[model samples]
Target: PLKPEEHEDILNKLLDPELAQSERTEALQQLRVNYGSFVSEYNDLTKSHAHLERMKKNMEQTIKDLQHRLDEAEQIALKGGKKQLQKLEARVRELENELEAEQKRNAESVKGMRKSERRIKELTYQTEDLEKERDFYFGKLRNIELICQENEGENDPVLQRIVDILYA
Candidate 1:
């Protein structure tokens, strides 16, 4: 990835005499010495450049591995989450069915309760009629007793016989 050959091509381009190394002239003593320092310093900078490129490539490899791990972990978690979601959907459907059954049970209880209420009303009316019939009999018997008391000493034979039969 560093493209080391390409980097060297650019390095050859920068070695221009106009920029640092001057064209060798007759009076080139001080010029040569100053240019020599640039050569050493340029070598130092280029040496560190390739080292950094290698380090950058190594770090890029690390980034790729990290991305692979991230993707792998995300897929695994996504699959597990889907499983849970499916379970939840099933449970929700089951709960809906159970609620439906409970609603039917409530309907059944309401129908039975209303039937019982109607039967109790009918029984209450029947008991009330029986009570009124007993009261009527009691009133008639009391009237007959009062008439017998009014005729006590008159001792009419047929009337007395009727009163005796009624007592029995």
Candidate 2:
């Protein structure tokens, strides 16, 4: 396109008959070339602008679709994860309870074993004491029998009866 000053100068030249015919023809040719080049550039720019807008719209739609899918996936994962977590928690509690019961039983068994050990030790001591007492009584009885044998001629009837009873 011609500038304002150039357009006015060309109009003045076209009106003046004294202007060279060759100069007029050259100016008109240059104006036509400039117009054609400007139109071609404008058309290319317009097409490029339309194409870029279309690409922008497509990208925006793709982003929205992906975001929707992401939201859906998150919701599903949350639901499944919560259920699994609850099950795991329940299993943990069950195991803990079983362990507690087993520990209590073990403690009771240990207590019973200790009580039995104490009773066995007390019985062993009682048996030893009884054996010692029995030996002492046997020695005394033997000594009395020896004395009676040495004094056999002096035995009274009551003593003889007592000795016979003891022997029987």
Candidate 3:
């Protein structure tokens, strides 16, 4: 495409009578064709520019709307998050209290079991002592009975009767 100055120079050349008529006519035809091509290309570029501007504006609006929605969602989430946190904290405290109570109960149960075990041990020792005492008494009674049998003739009848009654 020729610059405006170059177009003016060509027009000046056309005015010069020194140029042949055939050359002047060809220059005019070339200029007309170049002008038409330039106009068509310029018009197409203008339409493209307008379309691009509209698309840019729409994109900007979409971005704005999305940002607004994001802000709203963030606000909602913040509010809900606090509530959730509060609920979680409350639940934690409740669980902690329950755990403490259960631990205390467990401790008490362990204490009771220990006491029971001690009692069982004591009873077992008492039973063993009682068994030993019973064996000693039985041995002494058998010795007495042997002596009584050996001295039967010398034994007191009343004492023998008392022994028999006690045995019965």
Candidate 4:
């Protein structure tokens, strides 16, 4: 790439007043050809470099956008996972509470059944005592009736006493 100062230097060298006219013209032509070619190549290279820079910037922006999207997706997944874990934990707690309540109810029911069984046993024992008492009373009544029949038609005082006592 030729700087402005360098092009000026070339012009000054070719147009030096000390040079012959014919020699100055030939050297100036050569300078023009070399400087023109250099400028054209420099311009072409600059345009291509600008295009490459724009493409690189576009690619970098695309990568940044993709990274942002990936970060968002990860956050969403983490939140969803936390929610699911919370739901599962709550469900487990609920089931545990239900099981505890059921066990308490079953224990109460068993206690009630045991009380009923004891009451039945007490009633049965009382019924047996009543039956025994009734049997003893019936035996006494029959013995009295037999004595009365054996002492009938007796005029003795003891006999009359026994008869009166029996009727009474």
Best by lDDT: 3
18-49: candidate 4 lDDT, tens digit per residue: 88888787777877887789989989999999
Residue 134 accuracy (lDDT) in model 3: 95
Candidate 3 runs further than 4 Å off: 3-9, 82-168
Query: Using Cα atoms with residue i matched to residue i, what is each candidate's TM-score against the true structure?
Result: 0.47, 0.42, 0.46, 0.39
lDDT of 2 by residue, 72-163 (tens): 99898887796788889999999999999999999999989997899789999999889999988888887777777777476699778757
Ranking the candidates on lDDT from highest down gives 3, 2, 4, 1
lDDT for model 4: 0.82
Q: What is every candidate's alpha-carbon RMSD to the true fold? A: 12.3, 12.3, 10.1, 15.6
Clashes of each: 0, 0, 0, 0
Best by TM-score: 1
Better of 2 and 3 by lDDT: 3
Tens-place lDDT per residue, model 1, 1-168, is 224574465456556656544333422543455567778888999999989999999999999999999999989888779678888999999999999999999999998989789988999999999999999987897788778888748758987786776673
| Candidates, ranked, TM-score | 1, 3, 2, 4
Looking at model 2, the pairs that clash are none
